[PDB]
Amino acid sequence: EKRIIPRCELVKILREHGFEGFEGTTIADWICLVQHASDYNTEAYNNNGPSRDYGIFQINSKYWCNDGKTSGAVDGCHISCSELMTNDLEDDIKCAKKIARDAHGLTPWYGWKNHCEGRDLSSYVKGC
Ligand SMILES: CC(=O)N[C@@H]1[C@@H](O)[C@H](O[C@@H]2O[C@H](CO)[C@@H](O[C@@H]3O[C@H](CO)[C@@H](O[C@@H]4O[C@H](CO)[C@@H](O)[C@H](O)[C@H]4NC(C)=O)[C@H](O)[C@H]3NC(C)=O)[C@H](O)[C@H]2NC(C)=O)[C@@H](CO)O[C@H]1O
Ligand SMILES: [Cl-]
Numbered sequence: 749e750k751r752i753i754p755r756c757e758l759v760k761i762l763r764e765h766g767f768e769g770f771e772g773t774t775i776a777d778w779i780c781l782v783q784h785a786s787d788y789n790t791e792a793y794n795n796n797g798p799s800r801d802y803g804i805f806q807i808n809s810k811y812w813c814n815d816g817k818t819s820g821a822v823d824g825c826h827i828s829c830s831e832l833m834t835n836d837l838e839d840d841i842k843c844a845k846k847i848a849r850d851a852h853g854l855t856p857w858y859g860w861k862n863h864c865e866g867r868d869l870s871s872y873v874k875g876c
Contacts, residue, residue: 753790754777759774759775759779763839772853773853776870778858780869784859790837791834802815807844807847812846812847813827845874
C-alpha cells in the first residue's frame with residue numbers, strides 16, 4: 749500500500765523534532781535516507797525472507813520491532829512492527845533515534861551509506 753509524506757512536510761517534521769545535529773547528522777542525511785529506504789511511503793514494506801523492513805525508515809524485524817514471524821529476533825525498540833506502518837511518525841521517530849544513537853550515526857541504513865553519505869545532498873533540502 750502507499751501513503752506518502754511529501755518531501756517538504758518530512759523536512760519540517762524532522763526539523764521540528766530536533767533532527768539537525770542528532771548524533772551529528774543533518775536534515776539532508778535523513779531526507780536522502782528516507783528517499784532511498786521507503787521513497788517517502790509510511791507503509792513501505794519489504795520482506796527479504798529472514799526479516800522484514802517496515803515504514804518510512806525501513807526498520808528491521810530481526811533487531812528493532814517485533815512482527816512475530818522473524819526467527820532469531822530481538823525487539824530493540826520494544827514495539828510491534830505494525831506501529832511503524834501508520835501516518836503517525838512518533839513511533840518511527842523514537843525508534844530511528846534509538847537506532848542512530850546505538851550506531852552513533854546512520855550506518856544502519858544501507859541506502860544512506862550507498863546513495864547519501866559523502867555526497868552533495870543540497871537537492872533533498874532546498875526549495876521548502
Ligand atoms: C535485504 C536488505 O538489504 N535489507 C535491508 C535491511 O538489512 C536494513 O536493515 C538493517 O539490517 C542490518 C543487518 O541486519 C542491521 O544491522 C545490524 O544491527 C544489529 C543491531 O544493532 C547489529 O548487532 C549489533 O552489533 C553491535 C555492534 O555493531 C553490537 O554491539 C550489538 O551488541 C549487536 N546487537 C544485537 C542486538 O545483536 C548488527 O551487527 C548489524 N549488522 C550489520 C551487518 O550492520 C540494521 O540495524 C538494520 N537497519 C535498520 C534501520 O533496521 C534496512 C535499512 O537499511 O534496509 C533493507 O533493505
Ligand atoms: Cl541539511
